[PDB]
Ligand binder design. Structure first.
Ligand SMILES: O=C(O)/C=C/c1ccc(O)c(-c2cccc(Cc3ccccc3)c2)c1
Ligand SMILES: O=C(O)/C=C/c1ccc(O)c(-c2cccc(Cc3ccccc3)c2)c1
Lengths: 12, 213, 213, 12
């Protein structure tokens, strides 16, 4: 949800 | 440059009721989070555009996870070790309705990995090759992804020739497991939709996101 | 021993209304007969037990034919040249309901073959590798088939290094088209069952025999 | 029909 893949790749 | 040392470090960095179907879905969702941490550790992946990273992970996550639990099960006696810690053997898999695909995984992947003693460096390089899939649709620059793949199997071949100088065909033998991984991944994905479509098996967020457009 | 000269000879030895669906079925049946003559010319294939020859051809005929018409279409401008002589272009394929699989064939096979200038020796070796599929179920001696495959890509690598000494990754690049051929073959086979199941498209004897257990 | 594949492999 909410582009969990996108947000996991962004966060360091 | 694509050093195998970092690819192995990536593999090493992501190393940690009894119903097989429910465990399969739980394991896939659990390892999707670990898959992101793994990909970030593969050299140059994080340098790709964010939208391309998504494309590559959405296109290869299934095969990437299948390669992982197959190699993880080389020590298991005719069984598969899922990320939830559950060992699924032939009798349990057959009784769960997934006997055929279970058999393919053992004969075409697990047993083949065990017989040739595929090590974690070779596994990480194969998964990196799968990750850098230039055939993925929508890539803003497929040539760039192809260049990274070429660097991966260039470093893999050098590794095999140095580590196993008396096995000239080892490099090709490793690559020739990718066709089986491709067809096995497609069949596994079908079962995941069987589980989801029937609505009887719980499907968590991350796995749910991958199974939907 | 597995001389590339004979594999090329095998490829050279089998070299010769406008509805794409009907032509696809006609072409597949027509080339099944040619496929048998080709396999017989691959070194050591005819030496295998008769039942194993059947197993290998029943397991790989689809990919073997797909590899052939893909390489045959490298000269066609965004189109596929079927064995019946019909050139199917993108507009015709899309209007026939097979636009998606058509696009995959061109992007993942035909265009890739053309860009790297895959020659008929390399094509024959790839098809021989597919023919000698040790993963085929029922083989009386899968190790024997695996040995033949190993001899094939051993001779292929030597050929590439002698013919293209400045392309170190060419051998791996050739093998890395087999995963695409595997998934494309599976999708093509689905369409063949679409054509057969609907009963609207004529299916001739040999192709009918391959599509049935 | 009649194992066309078998008979094609047998005949020389
Ligand atoms: O454990 C992990 O880390 C990951 C696991 C995983 C990931 C993706 C998958 O598609 C699948 C997946 C699905 C359908 C069928 C199978 C075969 C099977 C596996 C076990 C027992 C019986 C059959 C695997 C599993
Ligand atoms: O010509 C030959 O020698 C052999 C041909 C052949 C053999 C096997 C096949 O599965 C198929 C096959 C089926 C389904 C879909 C496709 C794609 C396509 C091809 C052409 C136009 C549009 C789409 C190919 C074709």
């Amino acid at each position: 949800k909410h582009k969990i893949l996108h947000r996991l790749l962004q966060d360091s | 440059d694509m050093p195998v040392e970092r690819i192995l470090e990536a593999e090493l960095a992501v190393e940690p009721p009894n119903d097989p179907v429910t465990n399969i879905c739980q394991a896939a969702d659990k390892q999707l989070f670990t898959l992101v941490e793994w990909a970030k550790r593969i050299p140059h992946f994080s340098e790709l555009p964010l939208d391309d990273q998504v494309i590559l992970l959405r296109a290869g996550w299934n095969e990437l996870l299948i390669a992982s639990f197959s190699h993880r099960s080389i020590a298991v006696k005719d069984g598969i070790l899922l990320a939830t810690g559950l060992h699924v053997h032939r009798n349990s898999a057959h009784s769960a309705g997934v006997g055929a695909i279970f058999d393919r995984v053992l004969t075409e992947l697990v047993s083949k990995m065990r017989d040739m003693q595929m090590d974690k460096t070779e596994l990480g390089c194969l998964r990196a090759i799968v990750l850098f899939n230039p055939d993925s649709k929508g890539l803003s620059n497929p040539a760039e992804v192809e260049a990274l793949r070429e660097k991966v199997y260039a470093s893999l071949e050098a590794y095999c020739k140095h580590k196993y100088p008396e096995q000239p065909g080892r490099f090709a033998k490793l690559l020739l497991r990718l066709p089986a991984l491709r067809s096995i991944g497609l069949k596994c994905l079908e079962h995941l939709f069987f589980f989801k479509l029937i609505g009887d098996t719980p499907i968590d967020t991350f796995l749910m996101e991958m199974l939907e457009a």
